[PDB]
Write a protein that binds this DNA or RNA. Structure first.
Lengths: 126, 131, 131, 126, 126, 131, 126, 126, 126, 126, 126, 126, 126, 126
DNA sequence: ATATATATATATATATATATATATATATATATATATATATATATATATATATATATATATATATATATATATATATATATATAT
DNA sequence: ATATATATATATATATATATATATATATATATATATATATATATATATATATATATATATATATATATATATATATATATATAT
């Protein structure tokens, strides 16, 4: 399903948002462009989520906790993207991890050991 | 007034038009929009104003330049949301811990300093944040 | 309110448009949609809210983290449905047996634990589940 | 009938759902894609149902009970697909079977012996 | 996102402003023209902002201060464009910098050293 | 009168038509426009008139030719806005400094002279500039 | 902006003035014609204004005074167009200049030397 | 302006006079026809006026007096058109000129010598 | 003007007389038909009037008297049309002429010689 | 005029009689039908009247008497139509003629010889 | 006239009876239906009347007596329609004829021989 | 009748109650809403009554007693709805039945055996 | 019923209060606005009442006492709203509870243990 | 409530004051205008009152004293508005404060320290 | 009657992404409208002074024509209403 | 099978009005266009120079809604397909 249905329908979504009042040379052309951005923008996080799934199976750890392994990973990737503006990533990374890990009950909910592993896997995504 | 209040009608304008261009029923749209503009305006301004107002007053008190408020405001809300998150999902000890650990986290940005630690303490003690 | 109530109009919005784009009659559509939104909203919220509410309150009481509720809620409904299935199709002894055997089954997931066994006992005793 | 009529009309269905307001470069292209997913997604369960039919004839057991042999099989396949996330399939399998079999009056309605045979046939589907 | 979404939607904006009462030979043709002006007009400042981002990373200085590094840069570019009318740019440049730098608390908020660097980078934009 | 007052209706005219051509609701438009024309007329004339009036009277007093007012008016407002900017964002010493440093900056234009320095002193002391 | 936006929107203006009651075979055709006249009619003065801008930079004289260098130039061009009816341009030219220059405080506001230069540049426009 | 704007708008005028109650097959068709008559009917006098302009420049005589050179010329052309009914144009011409010239203060206001020249130029228009 | 404006507007007249309450399939269709009758019905008399104009120029006789040359001609044509019912046109013709000529002060006002010429020209119209 | 104006306006008449309260699917459709009956019903008598006109010219007899040649003819045609019910037309014909002719002062007013000729011409109309 | 005018106007009648207060989806639809019943209901008697007309011509008998040939025929047809309820038509027929004929002065007024012929012609109508 | 007439007219009722003074955007919208509540609110009891009808036929018991089988059933359903507030339904149920059955002459009037059956059927309605 | 009937009729109420003398642009617009305030203003207390209902069922305590569980809860919420002005809510809360609980016979009428539970549930409403 | 109910009803008030004798083109148009003035005129004081509420919470001072914090603030704002006529605001401000503070028992009733803070907050309102 | 699957919408719990709208803080840019100060240009309307032209209406004098209504004299026809 | 009205059309023959068109000959208004020559407004565009709003896009940084898509996990409807 996620192999193709996304771009096909996502384009349909935008067409609807653009409205039937907008000539097709704009309606479709804008749609296609915005979709391409969705595909490119979405993928990086999608890759993380898929990787996380495999990590948990590898570790032999709970499926429910994916809600947080994912949240944790996704939050950090946003942070890693921001680091391309902040610079000094070494310090930014440590700081994001510091709370992402330490605030166990709200930022992890998952073993700090596995949370860090995710932090490391996410780091590798640049 | 106008810069926080009129947003109701401007937001309304689009939400209606978005649907209107779909060939939808005028009445259903008016209803769906009404609910949308209410949820938008109400939830946004309630949570945001409480934080933004405290944030603005504190930062001004502390001689923060207008170009500096963005950092502290962007944090103000982010932090304020994490405060709710904890009040909702975590033990009181974790709410307190997270608040302090987040203040530390915020160091990732050049913005972070006393101003942030002061602001978060206020949010925790004062504001019933929506999230 | 809005997060359970407004769904009536949002669901309505599509159901009408789905048909509208088929060139169907405005009146017939309005009627078909009305029945659809009623069935959807009524059946869904009635069954779901009873389970979800009990589920949410029990899990919160038992210090369940917000990220944990999904497991127990996904089970809450699945289990609650199986409860109806048995109340409808099986002898009382089988309803009781199945409830216990399902609690065991649920062990397939890391989620399963005391929380589940407590929740199902409640559903069996309390909620007139739709299925 | 089921040899071809499904993909032919299923595509027609989607076209209708998409709506006459959507340009054909989207209406048909989306339709065809979604259908392909139907074909691929559907088949695994279809194969089980067909296999079940033959098993009952082989065993010499009731046709009516197909309602449950099918329900039982289909439920388990969903479970087997989930096992690709859960891991430790050996234990998940046992647990699904434990109740699927034990709750006779509501999960089987069929001899546990034949229910298990189906559980085994379904298992082989990965 | 900013690689293409701007021209695509900006055109849509104008179409809306023009109004549904205006024939398409005017609505779209005017839209496309005005957009082209947006692209050309916008770019010069966009380039500065992007350059500024890199300068701060290079210097190892605060992200928040971009509000002013940008404001400072953008203000000066406007001034540099005006210099093409004023002439004697050598003097105009000095004067713009004089206050842009000196009024620290309201025109810079950033180290005068880095503010000047930006003034120099902006100058190179002609 | 007409050259400052009638602008309300002329501005209104477009703001309504802009939206009217979008197929928007007459009532919502009338409301959105009303707020727009108010904000426009009020904010503009209040801030502008105070500066423009003082600017016009001072420049006329100082024997400034009608073709010269543009420079001093364009500065009058720009400067007046910077005055607010400082009253809002900077320490009093910086407001005073900036005013003087800006007068210097203004030298970039052939316009700058005593007239400007006089005008800014007035704006700082007299006018509650909107910005 | 002034390279194309004028004809594009100016046409839109007229369309509005013509009114939605007038059939498109008249609304657009009249619009296009009137616009073409705008382009041709406007240009001569536009050229002067652009030339004046360059003259002041060349001379190294005040920008503010463009209000008058322009007014002066534009007034004279109107006069030069009238000379194509009046004849004896040599005398008409002198007379227009006589007051255009002499009434310094209201017709020039600019050095008579530079005002005359403009009078000469304008003269060359026929 | 007078090269095209006349027929374009004049048509618009008539459309307005005809009224929005009249079907377009009549509104436009009548408009176009009446306009064509305007163009043809107008031109003869337009040509005279343009010719008169040049005559005065040629002679080196006053622009203000065009009010009368034109009035004089236009009046005579009307007379020349009437001569196509009256016949004996030689006598009609003389009579029209007799008063057109003699009543200096009200029919000429212009030198009789130049008035006659116009009478001669107009005569050549048949 | 009379070359086309008549049929164009005459149709407009009838449309007005028919009224806005009458459906266009009747309003225009009736209008067009009635107009065609106007054109055909009118022409015969129009031809006479035009011919009369030329006769007077040919003869070298007064323009004012056209009021009667026309009245005389038009009256007789009506008579000639009636002769297609009366028969014995030779006698009817003589009788119409007898008074049309003899009652000089009220039926001619024009030389009997020229009146007869018109009677002859009209006769040729059948 | 009588070549087309009749059906065009007659339809308009009925439309008026039907009333503005009656939907157009009835107003026009009824109108058109009734008109067609007018055309068909009217023609037979129209033909007689036209024939009568020619007969009088042929005979060389008075135009005024058409009032009676027509009345006589029209009355008889009504009688001939009635004969299609009465039968024994030979006798009915004679009887209608007997008085139509004999009551000279009120049924003819025209020579019995010519009245009979009309009776014969009318007879031929069946 | 009777070839079409009946259905056209009869519909108009009903529309009037229905009233202007009744929505057109009812006013016209009911009208059209009721009219169709008029056409079908009316025709059977219309056919008789037309047949009777021809019978009298065939027989060579009085036109005035149509009042009774018609009354007689129409009365009997009503009776024949009733016979489809009464059965034993052979006897009902005889009885209707018995008085229809015997009461000469009030049921016939026409020769019993011709009255019977009509009774026979009507009988054939079933 | 009860398949549709209820919602159709019930809406009409409310419209009347609302009054002709209330604008239609309120009159109809309120009506429709209140009706929907009638439909939903009514149905539960309607279902019981229909079920009761069938039970009596099944049992082979008196029709007249429906007055009480219905009253009994309806009363209990009200009680069952109240139990959703009271909780401990097991005890509330017993108590409602205790008197509903025991007070034979006023709460049942029907065999306690059949009354209990109804109590059981009603219980199943939740 | 309470799912929609409130806003529908409440609007009707206000319309009545406004009066038939007030133009609809005010009558309805004011009505709708005031209703929206009712919905928003009402809900907070409605939520408490609904929550209280469930608490009593959960606890297994008397329905009658809802009169006080509700009164108690509603009173406290009013107090909690006031605390947003008073500040120092910790102390205000304690004081409201002090009497709300202590004055058993008039402020509770319900076990202090359950009254406190309600005080706690209400507190969570902010 | 105060978010919208004011303008809605305030307009209603004026309508009532204007009277039912005044035509709606005046009644509503005047109403709307006067209301707009209410909104604009009212707001400045409303803002102060809201600010004061927050100041007292911030300070941790008595709610009852709002009667005076408000009175004090409102009085001063009136004074600040008057200063736009008086000029020399520095002195007017001091004088208003002098008594507003000094007459403790009647102008403040609140700590002079907090009264001054309000005087300062009000001052910032211009 | 029970259970799947593909899509479409809404929910439950948390978190992303693409776009759409509004905000918070400051500053650009493209267009749209109004202003400030002076001056053009294209069109739209009105004026000042005189004179045309195209159409639209009315008149002065006489006479047609096409239609619309009424009359004068007799007689039809199509429909509409009432009578015998 | 025939008539009396009224409204429409027609025939023979003519007229009085009213509205439209035309001929000869001319004018008074009104609306449109033009010539010579200039201006006051209003709406559009532009030049020099700057700003207040509103709508769109963007930069830094973050959020509240709404609509779409996705991940983990499950369900209630509706529309399509399938198995018995």
């Amino acid at each position: 399903r996620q192999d193709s249905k996304d771009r096909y329908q996502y384009k349909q979504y935008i067409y609807r948002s653009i409205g039937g009042i907008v000539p097709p040379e704009m309606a479709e052309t804008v749609t296609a462009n915005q979709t391409a951005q969705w595909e490119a923008g979405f993928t990086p996080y999608h890759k993380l989520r898929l990787a996380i799934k495999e990590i948990c199976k590898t570790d032999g750890i709970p499926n429910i906790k994916w809600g947080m392994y994912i949240a944790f990973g996704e939050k950090l990737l946003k942070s890693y993207l921001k680091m391309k503006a902040g610079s000094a990533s070494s310090d930014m990374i440590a700081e994001y991890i510091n709370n992402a890990i330490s605030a166990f009950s709200s930022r992890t909910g998952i073993s700090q050991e596995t949370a860090q592993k995710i932090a490391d896997f996410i780091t590798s995504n640049y | 007034r106008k810069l926080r209040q009129d947003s109701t009608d401007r937001y309304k304008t689009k939400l209606y038009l978005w649907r209107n261009l779909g060939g939808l029923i005028p009445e259903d749209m008016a209803i769906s929009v009404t609910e949308s503009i209410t949820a938008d305006w109400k939830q946004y301004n309630d949570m945001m104003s409480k934080v933004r107002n405290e944030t603005l007053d504190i930062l001004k008190t502390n001689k923060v330049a207008t170009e500096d408020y963005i950092g502290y405001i962007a944090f103000a809300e982010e932090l304020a949301h994490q405060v709710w998150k904890n009040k909702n999902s975590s033990p009181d000890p974790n709410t307190a811990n997270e608040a302090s650990k987040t203040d530390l986290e915020s160091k990732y940005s050049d913005v972070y300093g006393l101003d942030v630690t002061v602001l978060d303490a206020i949010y925790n003690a004062v504001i019933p944040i929506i999230m």
